[model samples]
Target chain A: LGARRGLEWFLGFYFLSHIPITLLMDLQGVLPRDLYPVELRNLQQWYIEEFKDPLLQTPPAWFKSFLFCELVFQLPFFPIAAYAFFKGGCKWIRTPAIIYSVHTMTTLIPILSTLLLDDFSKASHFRGQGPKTFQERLFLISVYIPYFLIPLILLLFMVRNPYYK
Target chain B: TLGARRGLEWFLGFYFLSHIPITLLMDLQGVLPRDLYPVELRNLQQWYIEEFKDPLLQTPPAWFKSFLFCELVFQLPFFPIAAYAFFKGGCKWIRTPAIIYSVHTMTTLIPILSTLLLDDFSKASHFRGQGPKTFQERLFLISVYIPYFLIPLILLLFMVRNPYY
Candidate 1:
């Protein structure tokens, strides 16, 4: 029970943080590149450098569409998760938590696949440019693997919980 | 309590009805040649092909297709197990599946609804051919789509209770 409570709090805050994270991502489309915060700008620069492609210079359409989902669906989901954590009972919380699990799984699969598999030359604006080397693939996988794994762990926990009903 | 149980029964019935047909169609999509699909599914596929010409559906996104595969594979098998557990078990065992049903329904249905609405019903334009332009057309559309929205709402209300345990 104690461990579960700890997890509840951890997941609660983790979900809550998604609101601001999504907001920042959404802002990228609206805000001028120069106006973006230094860290975000630098991260964009790093992506360009790491991918050895200027693709991030103009964000991909799928990435933008994903941020739209984050803005619309996940932004509202954060508050519901917070309500579940701090005030709501198990029955109230369980549905949203499980929904979150499926949502995460649905959203991440494509994002990871795009990062790892997309023939960037054809898709990228740079035309004949993108990550090709094994090291780049390894680095990309290492960075993004946690995003895929965490929700799956959450789904397992949520599914296995005895109190679900 | 009895009322909630009945609601669960209704949801379970609805779930089974929806999944079996969808699974059958997915199987048909996999095994049959496109020209050999039943007329209804063939038309649906044709509509998809047409919509793909629309830029919005162009290449649609990888994640969207991935989620469809997830629905066909994971969700199809999930319903029967959930229905069986729900039918045979007491509340404690039923809770997780109930939550899963409600959550899964919501996550998938809402996106579908959005797609239908945003596309100005073009995806269902094929349906329009069979009906008159007046109440029958709108009625057919509503009858087909509204259940997707209402079932999730009903299940959420039924399952997301306070201390049902």
Candidate 2:
């Protein structure tokens, strides 16, 4: 109970603090100049003024709602993997790998299409910086880039026996 | 036993079928409009229309396996952070991080949202591009998209190798 309770509280506090920072930085810091189109931003400001929600200036309810849904859905799986870390099991590879593959497959699939169709002018939605385009590119660079890079870096840094259980 | 096996096959088949189309139609053919507002929409279309390899058209098991292996290798170590947080960190931190990161990661790389036709899977029907049906694809996307993200989540699921006693 102590372990469970301590973990729960720590996690609640950590996330309640970290996510806003992450979102603000991701939007404002990453590419503030081109993050949103005028109309969308204007509408958001109008909504905030109507509702008196100040944080609306950073990210709209849509982004935050989406983000919150994600947390509600996925926040429970970590301890098993962590337990496995101490126990040394085969799932250490399978669980996370499956997760990684699904994400990778989805991310790469569209890009593959993009690469193949670069010379074509028929499809225009995939083109320039607009309300969602910047987010799209940012998604590519930040999410996949880190997904692709960080794990390998950690493993290589730790130098664990590759073949061990 | 039959039911169990069927469920497994259904899950796997569902994933494979859903992804193949998503990978293909996510960025299909489109016409570049002369309007600034539609620029992002056009870019989405362009991304889908680009030349691409359809896994359904020409899939190699070995390639899929290789890709899975790469994801496994890269995502394994980094996964624990979220998993550990989920079980042990404060609520705000672990659960939110685990979910938000997963969503952020997938949206950036995979076809996570329904936007304009190029990137939005909803637009898939408009293009009439071949692949999985919209509902089936949505189910597959939702299923695979959210579940795998709980860092080390096998704790609840009855993984086959676990000491089931």
Per-candidate TM-score against the hidden true structure: 0.62, 0.30
Model 2 C-alpha lDDT per residue in residues B26-134, reported as the tens digit of each score: 3211111136335565456444333231222222122122324333343333354534433332333332223223433444422222221122323443224543345
**Model 1: per-residue Cα lDDT over B1-165, one tens digit each:** 557676666566667666677656643363335665678876674564353322222233344455456566666777776667555544456555556656655554445444433333343442232322344444444455467557756666665563552
lDDT of 1 by residue, A59-123 (tens): 45444444556666677878887767655245555556676776666656665665566655644
Residue B63 in model 1: lDDT = 40
Task: Write down the worst ten-residue block by lDDT for model 2 chain A.
Answer: A124-133
* Each model's lDDT: 0.57, 0.35
> What are the candidates' individual DockQ scores?
0.21, 0.07
> Best candidate per TM-score, number?
1
